[PDB]
Ligand binder design. Structure first.
Ligand code: ZN
Lengths: 135, 133, 100, 149, 116, 54, 214
RNA sequence: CCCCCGGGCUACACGCGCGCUACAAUGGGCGGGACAAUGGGAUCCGACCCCGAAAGGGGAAGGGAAUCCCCUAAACCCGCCCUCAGUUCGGAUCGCGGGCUGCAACUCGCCCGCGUGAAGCUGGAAUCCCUAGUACCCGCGUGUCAUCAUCGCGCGGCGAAUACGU
């Protein structure tokens, strides 16, 4: 009845653990957002994963797909007010990295201070670099 | 009759009242038997155990404490209670027993803080910054 | 009717003077008084640095100004008010009076 | 027999178990998606924390009434792990406390004095003393020195 | 096809300011709400006079805190860096940024060797 | 010509206050209404009525 | 979870912590007899008194002494067990609540295992960890010797208790084992003469060096 | 000389001083129980009520200081989860978003919410501070202040070890 490795979208997790910590292994999903997902799904976050039916897996992934439609609040989401769509939306794993890269690249394209700092490999948020930031 | 009494400890004052009764002892509206923690409960109960049974079974005591931490409050309360018990019973036997056990029961402590000095004012008067050479 | 007098000063002697004066003027006449009542003392402290430059260890200078306060109620009888307002108060004391 | 004669944590558990049979006390929409304070990081690990919150608020109103929504905000605060910066005490938020007090009023357990905190009604004062008498009748079997009170 | 939160340049160009300010982040929203200052209004007047005819000369200003609006697209503005007037040719992707993020002040540091 | 010689008014910052006695800018005591720098207070304090007492 | 009958304890007589007797105890070491306080009490807490008086270390209860030696933060500027044990925020410094609880659980385990009185066990441990000899450097004609010198009954106790608490602090550093359990193990070993005791080890080491330098 | 308008003192291959935060169980998290003192307050402190998930916003009693406010402090106790692991330790660094103070926040400001998750597993030679309500540990006003405290001067809470010498 019990499994040792469950496979949520793309990523695999540890069934010996609780679900809120096992889902923490998908980049883009923390403990808080995992708790929210499980609550909107109807699952105790204290049960050892592995006792996770394909029923529940499918429900979780459909949730993750469109969270603001299932009632996940718009403020508790990764990417609100996307540049070209509005449409407060959420991104995990393979989509996420590309968004980071595209943001930094559009900062680089208009020749901005932040993009130049990203290029050179230096700080961006106003820190002082004389005594620290040693490689 | 009624006997009122007081007790002190660092930034803490306790006022106690004693009379005839059943054996109840309240410290600031809650009974002593359920004071927390135990290290502060034994401190207050010590004199009531020393005095005995036929003495406390026939007195009702009350205490109101204000200021300075749970340990300060408990000690001030023990002091007040002991003074009131002695004033109410008039037993030099009890007096000598209490003073053998611990004399601060009736002769309270007389220690406050010491002001601070200007090298590390937050830490204290005698802690100082670290030198380099 | 009652009247309440508040006194403040950096000197205790002026305060004692005024207190004795009004106490005696109220006693020689028939008027029930109140006080004198001491309120807590107000201390203005200022800790500064001695050196006008940076060099040297830090030695600090703590100045203090203590201010003593008193309160009285006098019952504001017929002539008491007019005979009390006729007082010779030094100019290092702040006296105010309020009718309740 | 009275609230001042029993321990608070036990009393709050025994009161929150009963607060549920009362229907005017229900969690709102945003309860699962919310953190109980700026001074916190992770969400409550229980599904029935709202009722413990409202029981505690009931009893604090009882004790320290009239009390409004700043003293309870302070009593429901704590020190925040700020990272490399050192720790400081911070206050909680003012929607949970307010909705709790409103629901208690809807159930008729508290009333607001016009300009002075908020207080308990007689039935609100009956509830707790009843539960405390029960819990004391229970504890007197283990703490045989609790009878005289 | 460039899109700013779902709308195109032709639509942003007809949207008013209280409309176009709910599309910006909080800081630019606050700036526009509080109001433009004399020098900013002056620069805007110059930009409008220029994009239709009259002003044939180039735009220059010390105003490094002006926000790039849509009507400011297609024009080159010379902004101060402290020493000279750097020309920024504003592109559709600059909307919503300050005018000093593109005119830098310090020069990149290429180190040497330390002494004692 | 008379305009380009004298200051813009300052309601806050550091150039808003100035010592009554000498005219300094940075270090100024503001405690209880005083407006002296840390230097002039140490000289005029025993006149104002302060004591050591420590 | 502790039961209520233990969370709310009320003593009925004058016994150490209200639980354990102190009159059935005994001592056969006359050098230490008069420095081990075995007065019938309940709460062993002296709020700093008996400290500025030179010989005030003789009117304090061994249990309170052990408690104040348990209020530790590892070892700083020297090394024990082969490591610096620096904690700096996670240490029970000025927490007699926690120290009291530790010693309580320790004596509990001792009574549970040995079937004897934990205070008598502790007395035998202190005996068998009391060093009778040490070294020093004396000078004549301007050179430094190394002599063996007798130790006094007031310093023997200090070293014994310190070493017991150090062994406890050591057996618990970054291991699944707890402070109370390690303290209980240390005391049992010191009493039963098992080399697993840091304390017995140190005693024999000291006496060995001293007999050598004799 | 005296004013304004923009930049810089915040630039960074590195060497040092003083400190903060940690490298776990003498603990991390969630929920509930407690207990202070010093000081300060006019376009200033703002209780009480109402909006907002939070940061924060709109009304507004009282107060010119034993009258009202800032103020139910933290470490501590109880119950559940984690059980010696680069982890439920650690919390830097980056992205999207929301707001305050201000004539003006890119250069170069503080605060919030969701994500990302870097070195660090107790430290060589050497070296510093401390004798009683003292040191260690815990948090709090105030000074600067239109906003901004890992600092200075003070306040209390818990509370030892060793020597009475050379
Ligand atoms: Zn001056």
């Amino acid at each position: 009845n019990f499994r040792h490795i469950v496979r949520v979208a793309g990523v695999d997790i540890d069934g010996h653990k609780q679900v809120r910590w096992a889902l923490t292994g998908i980049k883009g999903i923390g403990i808080n957002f995992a708790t929210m997902v499980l609550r909107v799904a109807g699952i105790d976050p204290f049960m050892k994963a592995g006792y996770l039916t394909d029923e529940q897996v499918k429900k979780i992934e459909e949730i993750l797909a469109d969270p603001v439609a299932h009632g996940i609040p718009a403020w508790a989401v990764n990417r609100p007010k996307d540049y070209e769509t509005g449409k407060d939306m959420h991104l995990i794993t393979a989509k996420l990295v590309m968004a980071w890269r595209e943001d930094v690249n559009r900062l680089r394209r208009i020749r901005a201070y932040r993009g130049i700092r990203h290029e050179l490999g230096l700080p961006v948020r106003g820190q002082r670099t004389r005594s620290n930031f040693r490689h | 009759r009624v006997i009122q009494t007081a007790g002190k400890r660092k930034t803490a004052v306790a006022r106690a009242t004693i009379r005839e009764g059943k054996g109840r002892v309240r410290i600031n509206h809650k009974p002593v038997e359920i004071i927390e923690p135990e290290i502060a409960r034994f401190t207050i109960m010590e004199p009531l155990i020393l005095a005995g049974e036929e003495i406390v079974s026939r007195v009702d005591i009350d205490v109101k404490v204000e200021g300075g931490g749970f340990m300060g409050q408990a000690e001030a309360a023990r002091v007040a209670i002991a003074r009131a018990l002695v004033e109410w019973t008039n037993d030099m036997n009890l007096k000598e027993k209490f003073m053998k056990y611990d004399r601060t029961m009736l002769v309270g402590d007389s220690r406050r803080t010491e002001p601070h000095k200007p090298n590390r004012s937050t830490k204290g008067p005698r802690a100082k910054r670290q030198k380099s050479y | 009717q009652k009247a309440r007098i508040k006194l403040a000063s950096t000197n205790i002697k002026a305060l004692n003077e005024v207190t004795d004066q009004i106490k005696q003027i109220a006693e020689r006449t028939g008027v029930r008084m109140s006080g004198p009542i001491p309120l807590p003392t107000k201390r203005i402290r200022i800790t500064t640095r001695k050196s006008p430059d940076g060099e040297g260890s830090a030695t600090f200078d703590r100045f203090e100004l203590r201010v003593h306060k008193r309160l009285v109620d006098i019952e504001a009888d017929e002539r008491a008010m007019r005979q009390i307002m006729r007082i010779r108060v030094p100019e290092d004391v702040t006296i105010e009076i309020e009718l309740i | 027999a009275t609230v001042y004669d029993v321990p608070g944590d036990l009393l709050v558990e025994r009161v929150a178990k009963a607060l549920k049979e009362v229907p005017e006390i229900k969690p709102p929409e945003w309860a699962p998606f919310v953190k109980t304070g700026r001074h916190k990081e992770r969400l409550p690990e229980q599904e029935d924390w709202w009722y413990y919150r409202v029981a505690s608020v009931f009893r604090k109103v009882y004790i320290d009434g009239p009390v409004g929504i700043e003293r309870l905000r302070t009593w429901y605060g704590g020190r925040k792990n700020r990272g490399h910066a050192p720790e400081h005490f911070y206050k909680a938020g003012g929607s949970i406390i307010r909705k709790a007090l409103q629901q208690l009023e809807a159930a008729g357990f508290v009333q607001k004095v016009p300009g002075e905190g908020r207080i308990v009604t007689p039935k609100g004062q009956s509830f707790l003393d009843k539960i405390a008498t029960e819990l004391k009748k229970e504890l007197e079997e283990q703490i045989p020195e609790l009878k005289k009170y | 096809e460039f899109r700013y939160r779902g709308y195109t340049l032709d639509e942003l160009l007809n949207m008013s300011l209280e409309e176009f300010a709910k599309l910006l982040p909080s800081r630019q929203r606050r700036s526009l709400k509080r109001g433009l200052s004399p020098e900013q209004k002056k620069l805007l007047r110059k930009i409008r006079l220029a994009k239709k005819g009259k002003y044939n000369k180039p735009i220059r200003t010390h105003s490094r805190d002006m926000i790039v609006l849509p009507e400011m697209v297609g024009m080159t503005i010379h902004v101060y860096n402290g020493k000279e007037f750097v020309p920024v040719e504003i592109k559709e992707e600059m909307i919503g940024h300050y005018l000093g993020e593109f005119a830098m002040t310090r020069k990149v540091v290429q180190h040497g060797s330390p002494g004692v | 010509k008379a305009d380009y010689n004298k200051r813009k008014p300052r309601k806050f910052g550091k150039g808003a206050r100035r010592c009554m006695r000498c005219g300094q800018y940075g270090p100024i005591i503001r405690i209880h209404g005083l407006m002296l720098c840390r230097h002039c207070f140490r000289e005029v304090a025993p006149k104002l009525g302060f004591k050591k007492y420590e | 979870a502790k039961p209520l009958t233990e969370r709310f304890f009320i003593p009925k007589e004058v016994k150490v912590m209200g639980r354990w007797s102190v009159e059935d105890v005994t001592v056969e070491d006359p050098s230490l007899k008069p420095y081990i306080n075995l007065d019938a009490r309940i709460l062993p807490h002296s709020h700093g008194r008996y400290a500025k008086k030179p010989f005030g270390k003789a009117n304090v209860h061994i249990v309170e002494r052990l408690i104040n030696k348990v209020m530790r933060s590892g070892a700083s500027h020297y090394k024990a067990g082969g490591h610096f044990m620096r904690r700096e925020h996670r240490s029970i410094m000025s927490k007699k609540m926690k120290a009291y609880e530790v010693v309580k659980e320790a004596f509990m385990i001792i009574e549970r295992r040995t079937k004897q009185n934990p205070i008598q066990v502790l007395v035998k441990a202190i005996e068998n960890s009391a060093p009778r000899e040490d070294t020093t450097t004396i000078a004549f004609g301007g050179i430094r010797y190394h002599m063996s010198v007798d130790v006094s009954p007031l310093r023997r106790l200090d070293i014994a208790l310190k070493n017991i608490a150090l062994g406890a602090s050591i057996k618990c550093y970054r291991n699944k084992t707890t402070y109370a359990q390690a303290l209980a193990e240390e005391i049992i070993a010191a009493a039963n003469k098992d080399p697993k005791s840091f304390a017995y080890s140190k005693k024999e080491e000291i006496e060995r060096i001293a007999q050598s330098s004799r």
